[PDB]
Amino acid sequence: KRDEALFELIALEEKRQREGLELIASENFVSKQVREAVGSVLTNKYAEGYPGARYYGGCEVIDRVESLAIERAKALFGAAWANVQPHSGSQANMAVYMALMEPGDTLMGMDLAAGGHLTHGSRVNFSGKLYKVVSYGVRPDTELIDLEEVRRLALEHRPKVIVAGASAYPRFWDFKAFREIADEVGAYLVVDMAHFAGLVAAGLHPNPLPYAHVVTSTTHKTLRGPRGGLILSNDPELGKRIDKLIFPGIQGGPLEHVIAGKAVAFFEALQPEFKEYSRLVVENAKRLAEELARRGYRIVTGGTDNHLFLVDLRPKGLTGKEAEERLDAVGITVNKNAIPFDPKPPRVTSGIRIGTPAITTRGFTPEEMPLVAELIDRALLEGPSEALREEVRRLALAHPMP
Amino acid sequence: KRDEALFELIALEEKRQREGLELIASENFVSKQVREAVGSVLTNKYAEGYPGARYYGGCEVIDRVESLAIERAKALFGAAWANVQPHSGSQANMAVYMALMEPGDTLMGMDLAAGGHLTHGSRVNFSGKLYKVVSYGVRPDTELIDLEEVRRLALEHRPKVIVAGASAYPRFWDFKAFREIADEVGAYLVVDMAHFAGLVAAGLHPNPLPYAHVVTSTTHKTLRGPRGGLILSNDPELGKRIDKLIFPGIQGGPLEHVIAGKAVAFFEALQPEFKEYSRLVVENAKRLAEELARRGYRIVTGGTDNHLFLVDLRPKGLTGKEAEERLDAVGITVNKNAIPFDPKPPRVTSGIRIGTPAITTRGFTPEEMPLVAELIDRALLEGPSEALREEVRRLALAHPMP
Ligand SMILES: Nc1nc2c(c(=O)[nH]1)N(C=O)[C@@H](CNc1ccc(C(=O)N[C@@H](CCC(=O)O)C(=O)O)cc1)CN2
Ligand SMILES: Cc1ncc(COP(=O)(O)O)c(/C=N/CC(=O)O)c1O
């Protein structure tokens, strides 16, 4: 008996995705073959352990799948070791923290208010419950990270681990300077590249591998793969330690159907067409930010080096919460985000975060960004209307999903 | 470009699953419609938070999918609250422990060799690293749990959490007695029903929900659903606390395509056919154990009340690792497994574990178990041969796959 109610919902969700403009920076649209792998019979196999050293019979083929994912990840990113088993970015970070630190140790990471991830030290998160968290942020005048403030905090608090990488930072990271600071205090440098991993793979963002002790990531977001986590390093000895924290430390059976999907995503990212896609992602984001600046918004840091940017809404007297709702009502999804010099509180904010990976996957090009900018502006100033919702729909339907 | 090498490996795994006898007790074969949901576009949405309380917009349809999974889980097990976001059985247990305990608190669980799971207090697992662990076992003569030994231990060590449930215990649990013991020391009773969740849903195993404070489970064993975790409780105030430990405590975005698969599996488990399937699972396991006993194999506790059994291979001079390899060579997939008081470490073991869920899904009946027992016996005594493999293959191919 088919579950009609459930599949009626899936068809509605497919329609919602086709007919809207997805501008949330951490979203993307996976290919059909990534979905085919994730929907495969590989979910039926228990395969605890690692290739050639499993706790169950029958893993001969699974071992070739997981080894293929590992070797492709190492070739794509220039790594000496990889672990493709983390269920999510959260589990990847948790395993690294538990391998390098003991409860009570100090963790330094980017403040949630300035763009950090929950996993970089939130007190509601495991990172803030097991460890002592010290946070860094951005300067109000530069709207950028201050490496001298980072170093000062590191010398004063002596973290065991310093995390670089964030969720809403629109400029390049200086991984070399972060590693120098870490070395000065004897800390490990962990880079969480989840947001910009696809740009690293395409050569459009500095690669953290050579400077970090360990690199964590999701396989979704700019890498355009299935939902899951990833760990990389140039140190196989440290990798062996982390392998043990993933299993038997924090996980049980790996999701080998999702790992097959990671293998597919790494194959796609190794093709030359991926570099072109990634170039367009960054060109779209720079062009869309410029077009909104021309229409009266201020762009934080004045622009972006990557796939996302932050819009200061104060010139138009809007809060991030109101802009979110007005845009959601016409099928444009963004999220509110604090700006560095923000007069409003966290639940309201004076900004929004926009990202181009998902619309770029649907074939949007830089010459269409003026039109996207005008729809956003109209929705913010005129508010939601049926005519505007129909224009978004038409535009969206004219750009196919994978 | 299609990833031809990866899909060739998936086709090889499909063939391996169709042409062998999958007797791993923790595996099953999911239906086509479960795979269809897991391979859906719902992977493209970041749904941090809970239904009606998400961080990001655009979740109106996703919320109906998750609520449907939640409400079906409640109806299936008779629970007042459910959480369907855990990525795995291990994450479900982690969230529960962190909601009920601080690090350094005392956790009581079943010894691994006696049957307990890694997350029930193993030193190489987070459960044994973060908490002080006290373990109960089984009696050396009957290989059954002694409730008076469990009581003594609880009164002596005063655990904060007692865990009932196991990965390799073949008999029924007395959840009323475990709750009485927990109440005597003021402990929470947590039941991990991962292995026998489908038998509970079908009414063939005592239901822990009235007696446990919290129930954890996986969705992919006896329940025959996608790979993932589940938490249930009759206390909605305890559920609220646990919800916060799942997010933002230990996970980020949930896997909503997998949650759609969970909704489908719950729909299948609510059908009358699922009760007939589950009855045959247990009938097959009892008959196969009896047929191996008649050939001189020692069955731990003498038999089974559920879907699995353990074979003590010490009298036959075989380690569990050797038996697993011999059986695998002829297409019979089991896992080496620790037995009560095992002198050998988990990488070697003195036994094997066998379960019927997967072959029962393929339509194997009790009258076919004598033939299965014969093939197992021959591979252990006579060793692998080409003629034995072929016989296994024919028998397997005579049964369809979902
Ligand atoms: N009773 C029981 N049987 C079970 C499990 C379990 O948790 N309990 N498993 C649940 O998934 C699987 C076995 N998985 C296991 C993986 C690692 C270790 C363990 O103790 N590993 C050590 C030592 C290895 C050695 O020296 O032999 C380690 O990794 O250091 C035990 C079980 C299948 N059967
Ligand atoms: C009681 C119990 N609790 C938790 C888990 C972990 O579930 P995951 O493998 O993390 O999905 C398991 C899995 N056990 C795997 C096996 O038995 O072969 C379990 O038997």
Side-chain angles (χ1 to χ4, degrees):
Chain A
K1 177 125 204 105
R2 186 167 172 86
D3 186 354
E4 302 174 41
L6 189 277
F7 290 109
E8 271 141 50
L9 295 179
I10 289 182
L12 285 170
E13 173 58 16
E14 291 177 349
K15 185 178 182 68
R16 188 204 66 76
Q17 287 183 24
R18 286 200 303 271
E19 306 193 336
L21 289 181
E22 176 58 88
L23 300 179
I24 289 158
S26 51
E27 305 282 35
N28 217 327
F29 298 106
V30 295
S31 68
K32 271 152 174 75
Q33 58 171 358
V34 166
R35 293 200 285 121
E36 190 184 332
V38 168
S40 70
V41 302
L42 270 62
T43 185
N44 300 317
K45 194 74 192 78
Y46 244 106
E48 288 179 344
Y50 291 96
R54 306 280 195 189
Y55 281 86
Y56 302 81
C59 291
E60 44 262 43
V61 184
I62 289 316
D63 283 358
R64 295 172 68 189
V65 173
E66 188 170 337
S67 287
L68 192 60
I70 290 167
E71 290 304 310
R72 288 172 171 179
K74 287 156 59 177
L76 181 62
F77 291 107
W81 161 96
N83 187 305
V84 298
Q85 291 191 23
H87 298 320
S88 61
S90 290
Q91 266 60 64
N93 282 343
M94 169 175 328
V96 171
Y97 291 170
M98 294 188 65
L100 299 180
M101 284 180 307
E102 289 291 286
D105 288 339
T106 295
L107 171 69
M108 185 161 137
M110 205 176 164
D111 192 33
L112 233 118
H117 210 256
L118 270 149
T119 54
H120 300 172
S122 202
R123 181 177 181 170
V124 296
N125 182 252
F126 72 90
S127 53
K129 289 163 168 289
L130 293 172
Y131 315 110
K132 299 166 175 218
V133 171
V134 166
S135 293
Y136 59 89
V138 301
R139 267 172 75 113
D141 42 285
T142 67
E143 304 189 298
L144 300 168
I145 288 155
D146 183 359
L147 293 178
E148 208 31 77
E149 158 202 339
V150 171
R151 163 170 187 287
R152 165 165 80 63
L153 287 168
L155 285 166
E156 171 176 320
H157 297 278
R158 297 257 154 190
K160 177 100 188 253
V161 173
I162 301 174
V163 180
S167 62
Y169 192 65
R171 295 295 185 166
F172 284 153
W173 292 81
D174 187 345
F175 300 123
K176 185 165 94 72
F178 264 88
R179 177 52 180 274
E180 292 180 13
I181 292 168
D183 286 340
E184 192 176 345
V185 299
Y188 294 100
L189 174 63
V190 173
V191 168
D192 182 346
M193 67 169 178
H195 255 270
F196 52 90
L199 304 179
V200 168
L204 303 177
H205 187 289
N207 196 321
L209 257 314
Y211 306 103
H213 293 93
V214 193
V215 176
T216 64
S217 190
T218 54
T219 47
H220 54 287
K221 314 195 199 201
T222 52
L223 196 50
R224 205 162 64 172
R227 296 196 180 264
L230 176 68
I231 320 177
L232 308 156
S233 185
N234 64 14
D235 184 353
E237 267 298 307
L238 197 46
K240 280 174 161 175
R241 164 199 309 204
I242 298 161
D243 282 335
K244 303 194 177 232
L245 262 301
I246 280 288
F247 181 84
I250 71 159
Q251 293 187 177
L255 310 179
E256 293 289 346
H257 52 303
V258 182
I259 289 171
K262 295 177 191 180
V264 174
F266 299 153
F267 169 90
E268 290 182 354
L270 286 157
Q271 307 308 308
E273 291 77 11
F274 196 80
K275 203 186 206 317
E276 183 74 0
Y277 164 68
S278 304
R279 178 196 71 105
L280 287 164
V281 167
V282 176
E283 293 187 4
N284 279 342
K286 289 177 168 285
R287 181 58 177 286
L288 185 54
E290 275 161 30
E291 295 293 331
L292 286 167
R294 290 209 247 275
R295 297 190 153 256
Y297 302 85
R298 193 186 70 87
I299 308 299
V300 178
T301 83
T304 177
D305 298 331
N306 54 32
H307 61 295
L308 62 91
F309 58 92
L310 302 177
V311 180
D312 181 348
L313 299 164
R314 288 179 299 159
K316 306 223 178 196
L318 289 157
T319 69
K321 183 143 119 63
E322 312 174 287
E324 210 170 54
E325 302 177 340
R326 293 194 191 229
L327 285 166
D328 183 65
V330 291
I332 301 177
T333 50
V334 300
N335 66 266
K336 60 175 177 291
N337 200 90
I339 64 176
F341 194 66
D342 204 319
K344 288 305 188 2
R347 26 155 243 267
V348 180
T349 81
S350 306
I352 55 173
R353 181 188 65 173
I354 292 174
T356 59
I359 59 165
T360 303
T361 290
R362 294 187 68 173
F364 279 85
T365 63
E367 311 104 283
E368 315 182 83
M369 298 298 98
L371 182 41
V372 176
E374 166 200 314
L375 295 175
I376 293 167
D377 192 35
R378 287 168 47 193
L380 292 186
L381 294 184
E382 301 164 16
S385 77
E386 296 319 348
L388 195 42
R389 174 64 189 119
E390 285 314 310
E391 179 149 17
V392 177
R393 179 175 272 118
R394 286 345 288 182
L395 187 61
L397 292 169
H399 292 80
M401 262 162 83
Chain B
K1 197 143 120 162
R2 183 161 169 87
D3 189 354
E4 304 269 43
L6 188 276
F7 287 111
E8 190 184 299
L9 292 175
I10 285 181
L12 283 174
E13 174 60 16
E14 295 179 319
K15 178 183 227 296
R16 184 203 71 79
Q17 288 180 23
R18 191 187 333 116
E19 300 193 342
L21 300 177
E22 205 81 6
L23 296 177
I24 291 165
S26 57
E27 296 186 342
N28 217 324
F29 296 113
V30 296
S31 70
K32 291 204 167 57
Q33 62 172 351
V34 169
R35 292 199 289 128
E36 184 180 345
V38 170
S40 73
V41 297
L42 273 55
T43 192
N44 297 315
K45 195 65 198 143
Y46 237 118
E48 279 184 339
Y50 286 99
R54 307 277 190 196
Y55 279 23
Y56 299 154
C59 290
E60 49 265 24
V61 185
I62 297 298
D63 282 359
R64 295 198 164 200
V65 168
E66 190 173 339
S67 169
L68 190 60
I70 289 165
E71 296 306 329
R72 287 175 174 170
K74 289 164 58 186
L76 186 56
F77 293 105
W81 161 95
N83 184 307
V84 298
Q85 289 193 17
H87 301 319
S88 70
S90 298
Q91 271 54 72
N93 286 349
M94 185 180 263
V96 166
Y97 295 165
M98 288 185 64
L100 302 179
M101 291 182 286
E102 300 295 310
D105 286 343
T106 293
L107 167 72
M108 187 164 137
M110 199 178 191
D111 164 85
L112 188 131
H117 188 247
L118 282 163
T119 59
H120 300 168
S122 172
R123 284 148 140 85
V124 292
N125 181 255
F126 72 86
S127 58
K129 296 175 137 25
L130 294 176
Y131 310 108
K132 157 56 196 168
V133 170
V134 175
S135 297
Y136 58 89
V138 296
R139 306 180 40 90
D141 45 349
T142 58
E143 298 168 311
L144 298 177
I145 296 167
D146 190 332
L147 291 167
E148 222 61 39
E149 159 200 323
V150 171
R151 195 179 166 264
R152 157 197 325 136
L153 283 173
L155 289 172
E156 187 176 324
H157 297 277
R158 298 191 67 77
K160 179 98 162 256
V161 170
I162 302 170
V163 178
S167 301
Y169 186 65
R171 298 292 182 167
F172 286 146
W173 291 80
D174 189 342
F175 296 123
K176 196 165 111 142
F178 261 92
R179 176 55 182 269
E180 198 285 329
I181 289 165
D183 285 344
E184 280 188 27
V185 303
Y188 293 105
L189 175 62
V190 173
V191 174
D192 184 348
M193 74 168 171
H195 258 271
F196 46 86
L199 307 180
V200 169
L204 303 173
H205 188 289
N207 190 339
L209 262 298
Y211 299 106
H213 286 92
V214 187
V215 177
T216 65
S217 198
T218 49
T219 39
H220 51 275
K221 303 185 177 75
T222 53
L223 210 39
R224 205 160 60 174
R227 201 158 281 273
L230 175 72
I231 318 172
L232 305 152
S233 183
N234 267 343
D235 187 341
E237 275 300 300
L238 219 58
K240 300 331 166 254
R241 291 172 51 179
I242 298 174
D243 283 336
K244 296 181 173 73
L245 259 300
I246 284 289
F247 177 80
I250 70 155
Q251 301 189 172
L255 308 178
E256 291 290 349
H257 48 302
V258 179
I259 288 166
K262 291 174 189 176
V264 175
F266 300 151
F267 176 82
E268 293 182 353
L270 282 162
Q271 307 312 296
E273 290 73 14
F274 189 79
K275 170 159 215 146
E276 292 322 289
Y277 161 69
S278 298
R279 180 193 326 289
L280 281 167
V281 170
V282 173
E283 282 178 37
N284 277 338
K286 287 192 156 70
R287 182 62 179 281
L288 184 56
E290 169 189 274
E291 293 289 331
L292 287 171
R294 281 205 196 276
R295 291 175 168 265
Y297 290 94
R298 193 182 90 73
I299 304 316
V300 172
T301 83
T304 174
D305 301 329
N306 57 29
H307 62 295
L308 62 80
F309 63 88
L310 295 162
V311 182
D312 184 352
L313 283 182
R314 283 175 300 183
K316 307 256 161 151
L318 277 176
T319 81
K321 182 184 219 275
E322 306 174 302
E324 180 193 283
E325 281 170 11
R326 291 195 178 184
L327 291 162
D328 213 12
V330 294
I332 301 172
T333 306
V334 302
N335 60 263
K336 55 192 196 210
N337 217 105
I339 62 169
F341 308 104
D342 200 324
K344 296 277 186 27
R347 276 184 190 159
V348 180
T349 82
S350 305
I352 54 168
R353 186 186 57 181
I354 293 157
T356 48
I359 60 158
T360 307
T361 292
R362 298 190 67 179
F364 276 83
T365 67
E367 303 75 15
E368 295 179 280
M369 288 312 94
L371 264 59
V372 178
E374 180 169 88
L375 299 177
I376 289 170
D377 192 20
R378 291 177 47 191
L380 295 180
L381 298 185
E382 315 176 13
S385 64
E386 183 60 61
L388 194 44
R389 169 72 192 112
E390 264 300 314
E391 209 177 320
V392 175
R393 167 149 43 226
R394 297 179 35 89
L395 190 56
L397 283 170
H399 295 75
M401 274 269 280

